[PDB]
Design a protein around this ligand. Structure first.
Ligand code: MG
Length: 276
């Protein structure tokens, strides 16, 4: 019932050394996260680009520590206009992007600050916080609508450059991605409608589940554990955080990580190495 994240593999399949280290983490709140010393572990990872989801904090109410991160001086936030402590995503980068835009260009789905998109010389990075279908699946329909707006949106960006999607995509693709498949098929995150919406995304915007791509058979690898009953302690989790990317980027895929032990949230960070 235990999992050990293999060592960082920092070379491409052609022996090309990694040049980019992208780190994605669902902070469950910037302030609750800072307090748990998550901004600590980040300094150690020293990524090139750091995507954060569920910042629970507008861009104007940013903590002083953040702007004062060591290398990530090109920050970009996206929070719900008249809300707080709800959703929110950020994309800090050591290098300044070519262009940055927010949302997926579809009025109904750009109301909750969930997507940030940054274009870089060789590719376009897109961080996201897919909307949870909530308890009682009361937002399942909206989710099914979002899934499509996003899938379609992604395919367009894809037709311009190779694509990379870092983020909490609220869904455990296969039974191996969650500790309790047999009993969550009716709960947000593992419903047919969602699971088979993730698959159809990988299949339509030529996208690969970087982790499962490299580690087709590793189980118990999760990125989320409910604070309820120390689920993390017993490793009863869900792999909801991903790094999906264009098939034309596999040649540059070095490794895709799952920082199982970094604390600071109810999600463990996940890192990605690419040789560009
Ligand atoms: Mg949360």
């Amino acid at each position: 019932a235990l999992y050990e994240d293999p060592p960082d593999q920092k070379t491409s399949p052609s022996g090309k050394p990694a040049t980019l280290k992208i780190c994605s983490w669902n902070v469950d709140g910037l302030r609750a996260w800072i307090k748990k010393k998550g901004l600590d572990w980040v300094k150690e990872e020293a990524p090139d680009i750091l995507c954060l989801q569920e910042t629970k904090c507008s861009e104007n109410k940013l903590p002083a520590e953040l702007q004062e991160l060591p290398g990530l001086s090109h920050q970009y936030w996206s929070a719900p206009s008249d809300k707080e402590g709800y959703s929110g995503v950020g994309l800090l980068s050591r290098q300044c992007p070519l262009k940055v835009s927010y949302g997926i260009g579809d009025e109904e789905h750009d109301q909750e600050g969930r997507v940030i998109v940054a274009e870089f010389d060789s590719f376009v990075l897109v961080t996201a916080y897919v909307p949870n279908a909530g308890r009682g699946l009361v937002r399942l329909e909206y989710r099914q609508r979002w899934d499509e707006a996003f899938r379609k949106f992604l395919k367009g960006l894809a037709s311009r450059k190779p694509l990379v999607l870092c983020g909490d995509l609220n869904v455990a693709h296969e039974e191996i991605d969650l500790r309790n498949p047999k009993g969550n098929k009716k709960n947000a995150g593992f419903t047919p409608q969602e699971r088979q919406g993730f698959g159809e995304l990988l299949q339509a915007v030529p996208l690969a589940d970087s982790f499962r791509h490299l580690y087709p058979n590793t189980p118990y690898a999760y990125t989320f554990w409910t604070y309820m009953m120390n689920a993390r302690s017993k490793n009863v989790g869900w792999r909801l955080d991903y790094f999906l990317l264009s098939h034309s980027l596999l040649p540059a895929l070095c490794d895709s990580k799952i920082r199982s032990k970094a604390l600071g949230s109810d999600h463990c960070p996940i890192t990605l190495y690419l040789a560009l």
